[PDB]
Amino acid sequence: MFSGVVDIIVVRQPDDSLKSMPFHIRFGTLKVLDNQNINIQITVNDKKIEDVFMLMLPEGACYFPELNAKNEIQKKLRPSSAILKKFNLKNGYNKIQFIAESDLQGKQLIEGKIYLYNYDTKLVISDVDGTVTKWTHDDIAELYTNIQKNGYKMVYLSSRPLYFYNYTQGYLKGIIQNGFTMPDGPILLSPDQIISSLNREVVYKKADEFKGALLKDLRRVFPEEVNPIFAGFGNATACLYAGVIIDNIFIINEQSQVEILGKQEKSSYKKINEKIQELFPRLPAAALEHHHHH
């Protein structure tokens, strides 16, 4: 029944090509009389994108048809670099709209967020439930704000059912703590919550493995030479194996006590923020860009 777009992440590669994570979109309130007559068009930052379209399976999952060498059509959740370049994305947040039309009248519109990162961007992962929520932990909005001000990008992770996705986005946007708000960033969704025929290879993972796979997939959109995930906040093997050093894995408990793994330091969001230059050292070029957009 979901209508919407799971936030999309696109990364520019050192050779100028673009790669993205999967496009997960649904038109849950559209009655589809015949899926083969559906075509989906794309508008980015209020500009229609020419010569790009998506198709829809009988089950409602949407994909990019792309010819392989055999002139066979492959059904792709991840569009080609050539297609992504037609979007004319800017660094950071971009508005994206998908419009499902048929041979008949009536067009279904959904709106999402698509983020563009350069390959040298440094990401800071945060769980939502239990890490942002306890009710919201104290001092988290000031810390995350100052992480973002030092040039890092907050990336949120959720494993709630798709039903709650737009609510989780509203929750994060509504936090305010002493004037501080949560930095805008993408919310990635555990893949077991958005299974279709297009990503069903997923189903041969055990339930415990989905976060780790998600973080490896996030890393894979970056080039082999870089290490993009700088730190992670949770409530650990998943961060470690996706390239987070153990000192940068922050695990909060019941009591709002934060354990800095591998230092076995017991700390807080307030105290991490006090030592922000030591733990999240300023990234000069990346910080300048954030400052001059905000």
H-helix or E-strand containing 289? helix 284-291
Q: Are both 159 and 266 inside the same structural domain?
A: yes
Q: Does residue 190 come out as left (phi exceeding 0), alpha (psi in the -120 to 50 range) or beta?
A: beta
128 Cα distance to chain centroid: 13
Instruction: Could you list the residues known to form a binding site, using ranges.
Output: 127, 129, 235
Side-chain-facing half-sphere of 259: CA atoms under 13 Å? 11
Choosing from 91, 117, 143, the residue where a domain stops is: 117
Q: Based on the domain organization, do 131 and 270 belong to the same domain? A: yes
Tell me, yes or no, whether 45 and 140 share the same domain: no
Same domain for 135 and 102: no
Specify binding-site residues for Ca(2+).
127, 235
* Burial (CB count within 10 angstroms: exposed 0-12, middle 13-18, buried 19+), residue 57: middle
Radius of gyration of the chain (CA): 20
Per the annotation, where are the binding residues for Mg(2+)? 127, 129, 235
Q: For 88, which DSSP code?
A: -
Q: Which residue has the tokens 């075509």?
A: 39
Do 98 and 232 have their domain in common?
A: no
Total domains in the fold of the chain: 2
Tell me: do 129 and 240 sit in the same domain.
Answer: yes
Question: How far is the C-alpha of 214 from the C-alpha of 15, rounded, in Å?
Answer: 25
110 and 164 both lie in a single domain: no
Listed by the residue before each break, gaps in the chain with C–N over 2.5 Å are 134, 235
Could you tell me if 181 and 71 lie in one domain?
A: no
Domain final residue, candidates 117, 148, 179: 117
Please check whether residues 30 and 162 belong to one and the same domain.
no
Q: Which residues of 85-95 are buried (b: 16+ CB within 10 A; e: fewer)?
A: eebebeebbbe
The DSSP element (H or E) to which 44 belongs, if any, is strand 39-44
Please give the residue range of the domain that contains residue 130.
120-291
Name the one residue in this structure whose structure tokens are 């995930």.
229
Output the domain CATH number for residue 82. Answer: 2.60.40
Same domain, 144 and 241: yes
Q: What are phi and psi of 225, to 5 degrees?
A: -75, -20
CATH number for the domain that contains residue 234: 3.40.50.1000
Q: For residue 83, which of 50, 111, 45 has the smallest C-alpha distance?
A: 50
93 and 144 housed in the same domain: no
The reply to whether 125 and 237 lie within a common domain is yes
